[PDB]
Amino acid sequence: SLDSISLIKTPIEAELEDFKALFDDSNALLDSVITHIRKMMRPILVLLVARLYGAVTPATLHAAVSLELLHTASLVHDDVVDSVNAIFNNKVSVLAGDYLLATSLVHAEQTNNYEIIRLVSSLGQKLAEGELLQLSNVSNFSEEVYFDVIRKKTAALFAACAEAAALSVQVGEEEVAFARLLGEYIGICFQIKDDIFDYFDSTGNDMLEGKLTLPALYALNTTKDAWAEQIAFKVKEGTATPDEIVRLIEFTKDNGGIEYACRTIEQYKKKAFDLLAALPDSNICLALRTYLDYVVARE
Amino acid sequence: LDSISLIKTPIEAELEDFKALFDALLDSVITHIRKRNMMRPILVLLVARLYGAVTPATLHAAVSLELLHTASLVHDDVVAIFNNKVSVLAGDYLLATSLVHAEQTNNYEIIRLVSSLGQKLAEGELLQLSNVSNHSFSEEVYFDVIRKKTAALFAACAEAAALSVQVGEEEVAFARLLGEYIGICFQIKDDIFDYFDSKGKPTGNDMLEGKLTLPALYALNTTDAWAEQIAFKVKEGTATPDEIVRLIEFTKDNGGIEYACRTIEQYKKKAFDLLAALPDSNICLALRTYLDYVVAR
Incomplete structure (x- = not known):
């Protein structure tokens, strides 16, 4: 129907x-x-x-x-x-x-x-x-x-x-x-969106680097299993193994880490929309709403 | 803290x-x-x-x-x-x-x-x-x-x-x-020190770093194709503490340090001569002195 990219860029083409x-200044x-x-x-x-x-x-x-x-x-x-080469x-x-x-x-x-x-x-x-x-x-x-x-x-x-x-x-x-x-608000939706991507192949990189992002954090807080609490210690410690990460990643999914990260994104998106509702509508307002939908919906 | 006092006092x-x-x-x-x-x-x-x-x-x-x-x-x-x-x-x-x-x-x-x-x-x-x-x-x-x-x-x-x-x-x-003019004086001086013995600090560190500063450059220019290759080694990325050793001596023997000292001296004259466009003062005095310090070092 409506071409999103157009609603976003056309007005600023x-x-x-x-x-x-x-x-x-040349080299x-x-x-x-x-x-x-x-x-x-x-x-x-x-x-x-x-x-x-x-x-x-x-x-x-x-x-x-x-x-x-x-x-x-x-x-x-x-x-x-992040030898001679x-x-x-x-x-x-x-x-x-x-x-x-x-x-x-x-x-x-x-x-x-x-x-x-x-x-x-x-x-x-x-x-x-x-x-x-x-x-x-x-x-x-x-x-x-x-x-x-x-x-x-x-x-x-x-x-x-x-x-x-x-x-x-x-x-x-x-x-x-x-x-x-x-x-x-937009930067937060964007960042959380990116963190979710890491839990999928298109893997688990942020963990290899020592990071536990929203979805994981969520699963641990709610579940609290010692096995999990344990691999997490290892991820932060820089000691987890490439195999263990796949497992914690998977534990996360099974435990609603994603659905929750997505729910949080929705909260910040609504905070953003509510902010925009103070402005009169315009092609620019509409472009921003579409921009923010496209960020969120991005997968 | 004597030359230093003439420099620092006006702006203490x-x-x-x-x-x-x-x-x-x-x-x-x-x-x-x-x-x-x-x-x-x-x-x-x-x-x-x-x-x-x-x-x-x-x-x-x-x-x-x-x-x-x-x-x-x-x-x-x-x-x-x-x-x-x-x-x-x-x-x-x-x-x-x-x-x-x-x-x-x-x-x-x-x-x-x-x-x-x-x-x-x-x-x-x-x-x-x-x-x-x-x-x-x-x-x-x-x-x-x-x-x-x-x-x-x-x-x-x-x-x-x-x-x-x-x-x-x-x-x-x-x-x-x-x-x-001051910064050029300052840099050439520094480069020179790489050529003399600092009574654990190795001479020619610059060569050791792949660079042929003024006095070497000068020797390699009014001159013994042997050195040229010792030089291309420094740039080539490979030379040894000895090579860069003798090369420094050739640099010292072919008039490479004086030229640089007299080049420093020309630049210092340009800066001194610029200052001559201002009225004398404790500031001007402090500057001329500052400039002497940058050279005698």
């Missing part, structure tokens, strides 16, 4: 093109690596949110580029953290990441907006810090800790995107605050 | 302020902070004083750049997994904290300055890491590297200092140029 151009190595790593879920969010308030300005585009560069840089730097990939890729990261800052400044500069830089700080926390973890299963981490990372980026979108069109503090919460 | 108060503003993670950030451990901040405060009183913008600029400098040093140490993991994360932090201080200057041109510098410094490391592929003994590359790297940071320090007290474009350009 032209500014999407402007963003893609703007998203793309034989530089060109190869930056050029080399060069769906826009976050840029689409930045554009739609700005269009809630006004026309997209060149500041909106630089914001979107800036934040997208910041995200790209940390993904690149994360691979690094290992080291090699590593040295330039850290420098590539540092470049993307500086370029990210240039774009923020090209917004000619202090708050946006403040937002991007402080966000850069936040991301650095928590993730430097994960490495030093001194003490070990609550959702609370799980959500806190999401709010500090993936959802922090989505919130930043939306917040920057509003600052870029210069609306008041409440609208900026409204946009930030919106983006945060 | 703002030096404190700077240090003040400069101050599980925190425990691994301050440990690497102790592994690396104020030439640059001093330069910033002195240049500003040439023009007016130090502002909070001035201090944030100094902290900003000093942190940018620290993060690249910390990232340059990726040159097993825990140490690698550590530097990147720490580096990235200091880096993000740098941009925070740049924004706290409440001055767009400085934010532009720092961010573009961050760009150039990076790109300037792929410019050297692409250099190894090239088998050439030209100073044109050598200086270029210095200008995109060490000298770019000193230039930025001077330039941001000027912006930080809001003087004109002429004055800002004058400062930038001064800072560049």
Whole structure:
């Protein structure tokens, strides 16, 4: 019936093109690596949110580029953290990441907006810090800790995107605050959606890396079997086995971990819709509702 | 603490302020902070004083750049997994904290300055890491590297200092140029030390790192095809503590250290001659002295 993608992008078609151009000082190595790593879920969010308030300005585009560069840089730097050919990939890729990261800052400044500069830089700080926390973890299963981490990372980026979108069109503090919460809710649905995917083949990777995501956490809290509580200790400990993980993953499903993660997503989606109900309807509001349905429904 | 007193006294108060503003993670950030451990901040405060009183913008600029400098040093140490993991994360932090201080200057041109510098410094490391592929003994590359790297940071320090007290474009350009000449002097000096015996520290560490700094380059240029291959080994990635040993001697014998010393001396004259455009003062005095220290070291 109604083409979802169209409801989402059509209204921002032209500014999407402007963003893609703007998203793309010379080096034989530089060109190869930056050029080399060069769906826009976050840029689409930045554009739609700005269009809630006004026309997209060149500041909106630089914001979107800036934040997208910041995200790209940390993904690149994360691979690094994770024989002679290992080291090699590593040295330039850290420098590539540092470049993307500086370029990210240039774009923020090209917004000619202090708050946006403040937002991007402080966000850069936040991301650095928590993730430097994960490495030093001194003490070990609550959702609370799980959500806190999401709010500090993936959802922090989505919130930043939306917040920057509003600052870029210069609306008041409440609208900026409204946009930030919106983006945060969206970032949380998005992150939980991704965590669920890991429990399926299309496997169990987050566990191999030490992570227990919402579905697992749910099964343990409700069931509390010692065998489970035990493999979980092993996952966090970095000691679980590739085979054990498949089993805990499976234990999770059988114990309603997914249905519950999906129910939580629904709660945050409703929080988001309820937030949007304060706005008059428009093609932009409709585009955002479809965006959020497409995030959630994605599988 | 005699030359030092002529330099520091005129800005003793703002030096404190700077240090003040400069101050599980925190425990691994301050440990690497102790592994690396104020030439640059001093330069910033002195240049500003040439023009007016130090502002909070001035201090944030100094902290900003000093942190940018620290993060690249910390990232340059990726040159097993825990140490690698550590530097990147720490580096990235200091880096993000740098941009925070740049924004706290409440001055767009400085934010532009720092961010573009961050760009150039990076790109300037792929410019050297692409250099190894090239088998050439030209100073044109050598200086270029210095200008995109060490000298770019000193230039930025001077330039941001000027912006930080809001003087004109002429004055800002004058400062930038001064800072560049100082940083070039600073870098060449450093490179030279790699050539002499530091009364556990191996001579020619740079060669040991795959780099042929000015004096070698000079020897290999007014010259004994044997050395050329000892050189291509350093770049080729393979040479041994002995080879790089004799090569250093040839460098010392073919007039490679004097040339560099007299090149340092020319640049130092350009910077001295720029200062001659300002009225004498305890600040100017402190700068000329600062510059002497960077050379006699």
